[PDB]
Every structure is written in structure tokens, then in C-alpha cells.
Design a protein around this ligand. Structure first.
Ligand SMILES: O[C@@H]1[C@@H](O)[C@H](O[C@@H]2CO[C@@H](O)[C@H](O)[C@H]2O)OC[C@H]1O
Ligand SMILES: OC[C@@H]1O[C@H](O)[C@H](O)[C@H]1O
Ligand code: NA
Ligand code: NA
Length: 330
């Protein structure tokens, strides 16, 4: 049956989260987390998110029938991974499809790996080790108009980004949150140009600067605006849009810049807070309309770790501003 007409859950037979949407082969492919009621301890490091596989979804139209393509990747088959298959993304280059995914290695450190297929629907064969120089969570692999591909990534608190300031993991007894200096600039998300073969980074990882409208860094204490997790990149009218979740303040916000690396100037809110703690989205153009894919905890009756993906239309103004979506108004 067709789905996606009035912000209803796109699928209900499994719990789904963290939707990363792409247009491949004229269809919308969605790469979400597959939530399960693991019953694991709930805490600020996110141990209650104990996902173990990925299912790829696809739609031929919006609204439309949603196809679940089965298990595309299972954690038991990822040689380096110990636990926690968190928000994934995909890319397409030269007839191959690449699934990028965050998982904890056997020392309980989040890294990002890649798995490879000949189909956007998978299934995918994981590389035996994670990407060298990767860390933390939430990859977004963005193909720019010039054919260069960039991985945006990172997440604070349970995503461990705050433990990576030196290029080496600070340890399990290091900060559980951020830099713990609220008057310093907030931690920024990471970016690296991808290698030609899509399996590695082509440069040392860079940190993205996010500033306010005056050009001053967004500060660590500014939880309404500062980066938490769920980076996404899209382009509109030649401008680069870095959007992301603010975490404990529950917003998707956006910031604009003139190149992949920024700096990005904070503009405003994309999506107001949803049912359930997390807020994770993607923004995609399909048949000349822009869509915001997102999730909430509505289907589970409010359980933060049992989510369902949804979609709604997103409106850019010609001046590059985006109209804020409030999830439960119409
Ligand atoms: O890494 C992130 C976790 O730090 C985050 O943990 C949340 C923190 O606030 C608590 O009230 C919530 O219950 C808990 O989920 O969860 C999201 C994860 O990506
Ligand atoms: O869903 C697991 C994690 O929580 C947040 O939604 C984050 O973006 C994702 O990787
Ligand atoms: Na993302
Ligand atoms: Na707004």
C-alpha cells in the first residue's frame, strides 16, 4: 500500500531510524538504522541503541509503496565490529554502491567502515577493517557537482567525538559530553575528501567551523545551536547547507557556506523537536521536489530507542532560507 502522504510512519513491520535518503536509478533509496527492543541499559552513552543490522528501503514515488530489501549487512559479518550499528549512509560511484556505517570496534571505540555492493539495495560486503583515520559516528557521504565525494561525520556524548582532539582516542575515562569549556568554540563536525576508490580518506581529517550571523564561533554552552550529531550536506542554488541535530535541545538546524569545508553560518531551525529524544534527518531532491526524511518514537508509544521514519515536503525560499517544519501541526 502507498505511504508518505500525511507524515505517517513509512514502515511499521520493523522499527526504523536515522533515514539517509538518496536518488539512485530513478528511485528513492533510504539507508536507516534498524531499531530493536534489545532491552539494554539506558544511559547518556546510548547503550540502549543496540542495533545489529541494516535493511535498505526504497520508494518509486512519494507517496508510494515502500520496499524492504531484507538484511543488507549484519554485524556478525563485519570482522572488526563488536557492537552497535548506528546511523548509516550510502554513495554510488562508477557502478558500485558503498554503505558507510558507524560501529564500536572491539575496544569499544566508534569507527566508520564501508561495505560494497553492485546494487543500491545491497546486500553489501564489509571491508575487514574500518576506514583508517575515521572515528565517532554518523557519516554523510556527499557527492559534489564536480564529482568529488566528501564524508561528513561525528557525534558528541555517546558518539565519542569529544575524545578525538589529538587524532588518538582519549580513553574510556575521558569526557562523556564535550570539551567542558562552554566559553570556547563548540566542537565541530568532521570532513574528509574520499579517495578515488571510496574506501579511504584522501586527506587528513578537517574540522568544520560553524559561526553565528556576526561571524563569531558558536560556543560550547550554546546547546540550542551547537553541533551534536547527524551531519548532512546538500546544495541549493550553489550554496552548501550543513544541517545537523543539536541533541539535548532536540532541533535539526542548518548553516550555510560557499564550499564543502565551510565555515558555515548558522541560519535557523529545519525541524522542531519530535516524539522521543533523538532527532535525525536527511534532505533530498526527487522529481524536482525537496523532501525532509526524519524519525520519531510515535509508533512505539514514545520509546526513544524504537523509532519510525517519516517524510514531509521541505520548502527553500529563493533567498536560500528554509521554512521551519514543526512535526505535529497539520
Ligand atoms: O550518542 C548519543 C547519546 O549520547 C544520546 O544519549 C541521550 C542523552 O540524553 C538522555 O536523556 C537520553 O535518554 C539518551 O538517549 O542518545 C543518542 C546518541 O546518538
Ligand atoms: O540512532 C543511533 C544514534 O542516535 C542518533 O539518532 C544518532 O544520530 C544515531 O547514530
Ligand atoms: Na546524516
Ligand atoms: Na525558521
Amino acid at each position: 500500500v502507498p505511504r508518505g502522504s500525511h507524515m505517517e510512519p513509512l514502515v511499521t513491520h520493523i522499527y526504523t531510524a536515522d533515514p539517509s535518503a538518496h536518488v539512485f536509478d530513478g528511485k528513492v533509496y533510504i539507508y536507516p538504522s534498524h531499531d530493536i527492543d534489545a532491552g539494554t541499559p539506558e544511559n547518556d552513552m546510548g547503550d540502549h541503541f543496540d542495533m545489529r543490522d541494516y535493511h535498505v528501503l526504497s520508494m518509486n514515488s512519494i507517496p508510494g509503496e515502500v520496499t524492504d530489501h531484507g538484511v543488507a549487512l549484519d554485524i556478525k559479518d563485519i570482522p572488526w565490529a563488536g557492537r552497535q550499528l548506528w546511523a548509516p549512509d550510502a554513495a554510488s560511484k562508477d557502478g558500485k554502491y558503498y554503505l558507510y556505517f558507524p560501529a564500536k570496534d572491539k575496544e569499544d571505540i566508534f569507527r566508520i567502515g564501508v561495505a560494497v555492493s553492485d546494487s543500491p539495495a545491497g546486500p553489501f560486503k564489509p571491508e575487514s577493517e574500518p576506514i583508517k583515520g575515521s572515528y565517532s559516528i554518523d557519516p554523510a557521504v556527499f557527492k559534489d557537482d564536480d564529482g568529488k565525494y566528501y564524508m561528513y561525520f561525528g557525534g558528541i556524548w555517546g558518539g565519542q567525538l569529544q575524545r578525538w582532539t589529538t587524532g588518538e582516542y582519549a580513553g574510556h575515562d575521558a569526557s562523556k559530553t564535550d570539551l567542558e569549556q562552554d566559553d570556547a568554540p563548540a566542537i565541530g563536525p568532521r570532513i574528509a575528501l574520499m579517495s578515488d576508490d571510496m574506501l579511504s580518506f584522501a586527506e587528513p581529517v578537517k574540522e568544520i567551523s560553524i559561526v553565528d550571523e556576526q561571524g563569531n564561533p558558536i560556543l560550547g554552552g550554546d546547546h540550542d545551536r551547537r553541533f551534536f550529531e547527524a551531519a548532512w550536506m546538500h546544495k541549493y542554488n550553489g550554496t552548501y547547507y550543513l544541517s545537523y541535530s543539536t541533541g539535548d535541545t532536540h532541533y535539526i538546524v542548518y548553516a550555510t557556506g560557499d564550499n564543502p569545508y565551510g565555515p558555515f553560518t548558522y541560519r535557523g531551525v529545519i525541524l522542531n523537536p519530535v516524539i522521543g529524544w533523538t532527532n535525525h534527518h536527511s534532505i533530498v531532491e526527487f522529481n524536482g521536489k525537496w523532501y525532509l526524511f526524519y524519525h520519531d518514537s510515535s509508533l512505539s508509544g514514545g520509546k526513544t530507542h524504537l523509532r519510525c521514519i517519516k517524510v514531509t515536503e521541505l520548502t527553500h525560499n529563493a533567498d536560500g532560507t528554509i521554512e521551519t517544519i514543526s512535526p505535529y501541526i497539520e
